[PDB]
Design an enzyme around this catalytic site. Structure first.
Site, PDB file in Angstrom:
ATOM      1  N   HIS A  61       0.835  -1.193   0.000  1.00  0.00           N
ATOM      2  CA  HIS A  61       0.000   0.000   0.000  1.00  0.00           C
ATOM      3  C   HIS A  61       0.876   1.251   0.000  1.00  0.00           C
ATOM      4  O   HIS A  61       0.575   2.233  -0.676  1.00  0.00           O
ATOM      5  CB  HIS A  61      -0.936   0.053   1.225  1.00  0.00           C
ATOM      6  CG  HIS A  61      -1.789  -1.162   1.432  1.00  0.00           C
ATOM      7  ND1 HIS A  61      -2.715  -1.558   0.491  1.00  0.00           N
ATOM      8  CD2 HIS A  61      -1.840  -2.015   2.477  1.00  0.00           C
ATOM      9  CE1 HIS A  61      -3.295  -2.643   0.981  1.00  0.00           C
ATOM     10  NE2 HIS A  61      -2.794  -2.953   2.180  1.00  0.00           N
ATOM     11  N   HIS A  91       5.069   7.395   6.607  1.00  0.00           N
ATOM     12  CA  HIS A  91       4.875   6.789   5.303  1.00  0.00           C
ATOM     13  C   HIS A  91       4.493   7.876   4.304  1.00  0.00           C
ATOM     14  O   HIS A  91       4.142   8.990   4.698  1.00  0.00           O
ATOM     15  CB  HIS A  91       3.802   5.706   5.388  1.00  0.00           C
ATOM     16  CG  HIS A  91       2.472   6.229   5.838  1.00  0.00           C
ATOM     17  ND1 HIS A  91       2.243   6.557   7.150  1.00  0.00           N
ATOM     18  CD2 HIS A  91       1.350   6.476   5.130  1.00  0.00           C
ATOM     19  CE1 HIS A  91       0.997   6.983   7.202  1.00  0.00           C
ATOM     20  NE2 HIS A  91       0.419   6.943   6.007  1.00  0.00           N
ATOM     21  N   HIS A  93       2.542   9.069   0.390  1.00  0.00           N
ATOM     22  CA  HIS A  93       1.611   8.828  -0.700  1.00  0.00           C
ATOM     23  C   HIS A  93       2.069   9.660  -1.892  1.00  0.00           C
ATOM     24  O   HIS A  93       2.275  10.858  -1.752  1.00  0.00           O
ATOM     25  CB  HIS A  93       0.181   9.210  -0.317  1.00  0.00           C
ATOM     26  CG  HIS A  93      -0.355   8.477   0.875  1.00  0.00           C
ATOM     27  ND1 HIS A  93      -0.762   7.164   0.791  1.00  0.00           N
ATOM     28  CD2 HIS A  93      -0.545   8.913   2.135  1.00  0.00           C
ATOM     29  CE1 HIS A  93      -1.185   6.835   2.002  1.00  0.00           C
ATOM     30  NE2 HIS A  93      -1.070   7.866   2.845  1.00  0.00           N
ATOM     31  N   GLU A 103      -2.736  13.570  -0.811  1.00  0.00           N
ATOM     32  CA  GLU A 103      -4.074  13.175  -0.407  1.00  0.00           C
ATOM     33  C   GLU A 103      -4.919  14.411  -0.113  1.00  0.00           C
ATOM     34  O   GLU A 103      -6.031  14.539  -0.621  1.00  0.00           O
ATOM     35  CB  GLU A 103      -4.005  12.241   0.809  1.00  0.00           C
ATOM     36  CG  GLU A 103      -3.433  10.873   0.489  1.00  0.00           C
ATOM     37  CD  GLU A 103      -3.906   9.787   1.430  1.00  0.00           C
ATOM     38  OE1 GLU A 103      -3.890  10.026   2.657  1.00  0.00           O
ATOM     39  OE2 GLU A 103      -4.303   8.703   0.944  1.00  0.00           O
ATOM     40  N   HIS A 116       3.150  11.474   5.869  1.00  0.00           N
ATOM     41  CA  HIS A 116       2.386  11.301   7.092  1.00  0.00           C
ATOM     42  C   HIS A 116       3.274  10.758   8.210  1.00  0.00           C
ATOM     43  O   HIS A 116       3.622   9.582   8.198  1.00  0.00           O
ATOM     44  CB  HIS A 116       1.205  10.360   6.830  1.00  0.00           C
ATOM     45  CG  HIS A 116       0.180  10.914   5.886  1.00  0.00           C
ATOM     46  ND1 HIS A 116      -0.687  10.090   5.202  1.00  0.00           N
ATOM     47  CD2 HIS A 116      -0.063  12.193   5.525  1.00  0.00           C
ATOM     48  CE1 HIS A 116      -1.446  10.888   4.465  1.00  0.00           C
ATOM     49  NE2 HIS A 116      -1.102  12.165   4.627  1.00  0.00           N
ATOM     50  N   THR A 195      -6.726   7.482   6.332  1.00  0.00           N
ATOM     51  CA  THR A 195      -7.031   7.686   4.925  1.00  0.00           C
ATOM     52  C   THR A 195      -7.010   6.387   4.122  1.00  0.00           C
ATOM     53  O   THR A 195      -7.252   6.408   2.918  1.00  0.00           O
ATOM     54  CB  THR A 195      -6.084   8.727   4.341  1.00  0.00           C
ATOM     55  OG1 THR A 195      -4.773   8.174   4.259  1.00  0.00           O
ATOM     56  CG2 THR A 195      -6.064  10.010   5.160  1.00  0.00           C
ATOM     57  N   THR A 196      -6.714   5.264   4.793  1.00  0.00           N
ATOM     58  CA  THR A 196      -6.937   3.944   4.226  1.00  0.00           C
ATOM     59  C   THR A 196      -7.812   3.179   5.215  1.00  0.00           C
ATOM     60  O   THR A 196      -8.001   3.626   6.345  1.00  0.00           O
ATOM     61  CB  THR A 196      -5.613   3.213   3.912  1.00  0.00           C
ATOM     62  OG1 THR A 196      -5.210   2.417   5.025  1.00  0.00           O
ATOM     63  CG2 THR A 196      -4.490   4.171   3.537  1.00  0.00           C
TER      64      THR A 196
END
Ligand SMILES: CCN1CCC[C@H]1CNC(=O)c1cc(S(N)(=O)=O)ccc1OC
Ligand SMILES: [Zn+2]
Length: 257
Positions: A61, A91, A93, A103, A116, A195-196
């Protein structure tokens, strides 16, 4: 299983996780004109000095860098936070292209990636309990421009080959996350979710205004990562971001004028 494609993507998440259509979902779009200065905010305290990173991981992910969170050594206080939140992991994105990957958006504008740094409220003992509380976690969001290289990210970028596919993890001691911080600590804050999945509504969001510039070569290596496991059809880990969500009954505050 849930992912980021056409058949398992964010639009398919409400079926297994009905909170997706909840009341405080993240990310959201931050309208800089309607965001309001909050005089009541205490100065933000980022104290990643005695931060102890351990390993980095590809969870099919993102890639996460984990921290020993067995003491108050890397902590986030002040601002909206009424408590002390302990750093456990961070992590990214990113996108397939530079004009997408973040995001959260700023006036609908989308960055190349978003960082994040994740913290949990210590009055709840562990992270498993924290996540079950409205004021459980606080996540620090930083935007990523493509421009000049960020030195304090390179040690990260170079170990990414050893964690190409889902399930892989490598040792990542003695990394200082302060290198990932921008210059200013001016921020928008709001009550949000993960957000996941499981998309738990347990998060205070602190998104910094000032992004960091990383080089085109740097973000390019984020894109070389795989979603799939070893010896599977090669899905490229790109566009691992959830689109902005209905703000609903929420105010995004600001820490400045
Ligand atoms: C490696 C550490 N893992 C196990 C224990 C802690 C956890 C770290 N993961 C998260 O806190 C998390 C954060 C987000 S966010 N902030 O919206 O980008 C979304 C989903 C998440 O987990 C399902
Ligand atoms: Zn995230």
């Amino acid at each position: 299983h849930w992912g980021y494609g056409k058949h398992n993507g964010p639009e398919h998440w409400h079926k297994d996780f009905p909170i997706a259509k909840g009341e405080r979902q993240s990310p959201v779009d931050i309208d800089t004109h309607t965001a309001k200065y909050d005089p009541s905010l205490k100065p933000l305290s980022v104290s990643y000095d005695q931060a102890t990173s351990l390993r980095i991981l590809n969870n099919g992910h993102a890639f996460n860098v984990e921290f020993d969170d067995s003491q108050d050594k890397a902590v986030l206080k002040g601002g909206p936070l009424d408590g002390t939140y302990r750093l456990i992991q961070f992590h990214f994105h990113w996108g397939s292209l530079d004009g997408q990957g973040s995001e959260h958006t700023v006036d609908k504008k989308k960055y190349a990636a978003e960082l994040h740094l994740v913290h949990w409220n210590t009055k709840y003992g562990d992270f498993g309990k924290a996540v079950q509380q409205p004021d459980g976690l606080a996540v620090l969001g930083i935007f990523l421009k493509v421009g000049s290289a960020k030195p304090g990210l390179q040690k990260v970028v170079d170990v990414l080959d050893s964690i190409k596919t889902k399930g892989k993890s490598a040792d990542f001691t003695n990394f200082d996350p302060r290198g990932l911080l921008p210059e200013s600590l001016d921020y928008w804050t709001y009550p949000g979710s993960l957000t996941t999945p499981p998309l738990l509504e347990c998060v205070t969001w602190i998104v910094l205004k000032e992004p960091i510039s990383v080089s085109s070569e740097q973000v390019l290596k984020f894109r070389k990562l795989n979603f799939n496991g070893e010896g599977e059809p090669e899905e490229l880990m790109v566009d691992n971001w959830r689109p902005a969500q209905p703000l609903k009954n929420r105010q995004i505050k600001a820490s400045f004028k």
